[PDB]
Write a protein that binds this ligand. Structure first.
Ligand SMILES: *[C@@H]1O[C@H](CO)[C@@H](O[C@@H]2O[C@H](CO)[C@@H](O[C@H]3O[C@H](CO)[C@@H](O)[C@H](O)[C@@H]3O)[C@H](O)[C@H]2NC(C)=O)[C@H](O)[C@H]1NC(C)=O
Ligand SMILES: OC[C@H]1O[C@@H](O[C@H]2[C@H](O)[C@@H](O)[C@H](O)O[C@@H]2CO)[C@H](O)[C@@H](O)[C@@H]1O
Ligand SMILES: OC[C@H]1O[C@@H](O)[C@H](O)[C@@H](O)[C@@H]1O
Length: 358
């Protein structure tokens, strides 16, 4: 649309991902590969506010971005993920979320939002783009027969509404997570998804700051594939562009001129999954298309790197309390460390298999 959040702004690079990458690159032995790995710290990515413990980090990024903009004559933009719902990841075998519905989880989540808003409010010369709650609303389209999801539904909707309503008050541009082509892009899922997202947008007052939806977050789908990945058989929407081209008109019909962002951070290598639903640490993944507003789609504001490649999606250790068995499938790189922690061998392959090359 007319207002693409990224136009006219310089993205603030994550110093934390930058710190992870710098430490990772010096351990890569081939000198040509190590220098390519180091350059990954210059590629814009999203900061995951996966716990209240991450909020102080957010505050430093806003203030730093503000100072960098003044030092360079630029307007700065900070990219974040809101990812702390109570009973988070309701359909997963295991979740790392710190809040539970049964222990005032919604109230604790709303205080988490309040703390984030209180940071953002202090730095009005820094633009913020937020992805809202990966692995939440999508579960409420297709996974209502999972008891935890049925039991989480009202809390997910209330908590996401609180996030949208209150982040809008400080001018945050927001994209609700909307799964990916293999999740909500099945033709039969497009209408229930649109109905849910539209109800969410309406409950939050149709704020213009609610730009639309984020897709492929932490996944591996192509934006545009010349040949469908065999995992996609039965779904004519075999890539993200097909999914977005199908869903967007349903949102527009409701009066929401929605736009989209698409994660491509681990999409450089296609045809690496046995089944489409295999999501954990998929072996052989490569860094994908670099972030850009040159998307070639009327509906897509930016290609982005939301999931930071190299941070594990979960342990393959079946004895860990956080073990998700998806992370031990044959197509999951193993052994793998606990979710969020650095997975050095995975990062090195992401670098080696990057497409376009680094
Ligand atoms: C795979 O899963 C296990 C994690 O649940 C882990 O085994 C456990 O590792 C911890 C850390 O060594 C041990 O807990 C220790 O905690 C205190 C430290 O303050 C020590 O004083 C205790 O002696 C205790 O050892 C657990 O005992 C241990 N549990 C078992 C059954 O072995 C494995 O290490 C994990 N393996 C990998 C590769 O990740
Ligand atoms: O896309 C990353 C995201 O996947 C989640 O699992 C989805 C999966 O993407 C989808 O293909 C399948 O159809 O449904 C599952 C949920 O049942 C996963 O739970 C997340 O941890 C992950 O971030
Ligand atoms: O989105 C960020 C923008 O929000 C506006 O309210 C501020 O006045 C601008 O300085 C800032 O660049």
């Amino acid at each position: 649309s007319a207002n693409n959040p990224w136009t006219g702004f310089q993205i603030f690079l994550s110093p934390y991902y930058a710190n992870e990458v710098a430490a990772a690159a010096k351990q890569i032995t081939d000198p040509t590969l190590s220098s390519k790995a180091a350059s990954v710290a210059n590629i814009p990515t999203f900061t995951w506010l996966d716990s209240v413990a991450k909020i102080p980090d957010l505050g430093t990024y806003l203030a730093s971005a503000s100072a960098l903009g003044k030092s360079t004559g630029t307007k700065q933009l900070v990219q974040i993920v809101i990812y702390d719902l109570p009973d988070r990841d309701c359909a997963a075998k295991a979740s790392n979320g710190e809040f539970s519905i049964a222990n005032n989880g919604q109230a604790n989540y709303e205080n988490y939002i309040d703390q984030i808003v209180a940071q953002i409010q202090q730095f009005p010369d820094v633009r913020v783009v937020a992805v809202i709650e990966p692995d939440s609303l999508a579960n409420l389209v297709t996974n209502l027969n999972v008891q935890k999801c049925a039991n989480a539904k009202t809390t997910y909707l209330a908590s996401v509404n609180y996030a949208l309503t209150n982040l809008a008050k400080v001018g945050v541009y927001m994209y609700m997570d909307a799964g990916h082509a293999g999740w909500l892009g099945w033709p039969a899922n497009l209408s229930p998804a649109a109905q849910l997202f539209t109800q969410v947008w309406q409950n939050a007052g149709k704020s213009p700051f609610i730009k639309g939806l984020a897709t492929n977050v932490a996944n591996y789908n192509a934006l545009q594939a010349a040949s469908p990945d065999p995992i996609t058989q039965g779904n004519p929407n075999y890539d993200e562009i097909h999914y977005i081209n199908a869903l967007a008109p349903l949102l527009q019909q409701a009066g929401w001129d929605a736009t989209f962002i698409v994660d491509q951070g681990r999409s450089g290598v296609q045809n690496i999954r046995q089944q489409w639903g295999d999501w954990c640490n998929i072996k052989g993944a490569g860094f994908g298309t670099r972030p850009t507003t040159n998307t070639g789609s009327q509906f897509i504001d930016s290609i982005v790197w939301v999931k930071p490649g190299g941070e594990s999606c979960g342990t393959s250790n079946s004895s860990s309390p956080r073990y998700d068995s998806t992370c031990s499938l044959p197509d999951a790189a193993q052994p793998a460390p606990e979710a969020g922690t650095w997975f050095q061998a995975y990062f090195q392959t992401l670098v080696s298999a990057a497409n376009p090359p680094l």
